[PDB]
């Protein structure tokens, strides 16, 4: 069945999912740029583009 799954493989499936999650979220945040706000919503903030 396409809609079915074996209940006894759940731990291995979850561990593989966590491995995929960690092994994907393995990047370095990069500085991009900023721009001073002109509108009065933020009180002179440095918005990021």
């Amino acid at each position: 069945s396409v809609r079915g799954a074996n209940p006894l493989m759940f731990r291995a499936n979850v561990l593989h999912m966590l491995l995929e999650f960690v092994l994907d979220n393995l990047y370095l945040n990069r500085h991009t740029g900023f721009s001073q706000d002109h509108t009065p919503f933020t009180e002179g903030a440095n918005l990021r583009s």
């Binding site: 999650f21 979220n25 393995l26 990047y27 370095l28 945040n29 990069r30 991009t32």
Partner: protein
């Protein structure tokens, strides 16, 4: 053993870093008898987080 493929260690990311997204499920009842349609910000198309 002569020439092993090098891995990729540094991989920059430019977008905002997150993994949880908020998703709507059912449409809202913006046109309703009780409250006038001028109350909701959806009528004025104000973008919300």
């Amino acid at each position: 053993l002569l020439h092993a493929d090098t891995p990729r260690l540094v991989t920059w990311d430019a977008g905002l870093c997150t993994s949880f997204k908020i998703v709507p499920i059912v449409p809202a009842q913006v046109p309703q008898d009780v409250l006038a349609y001028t109350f909701f910000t959806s009528s004025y198309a104000i973008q919300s987080p």
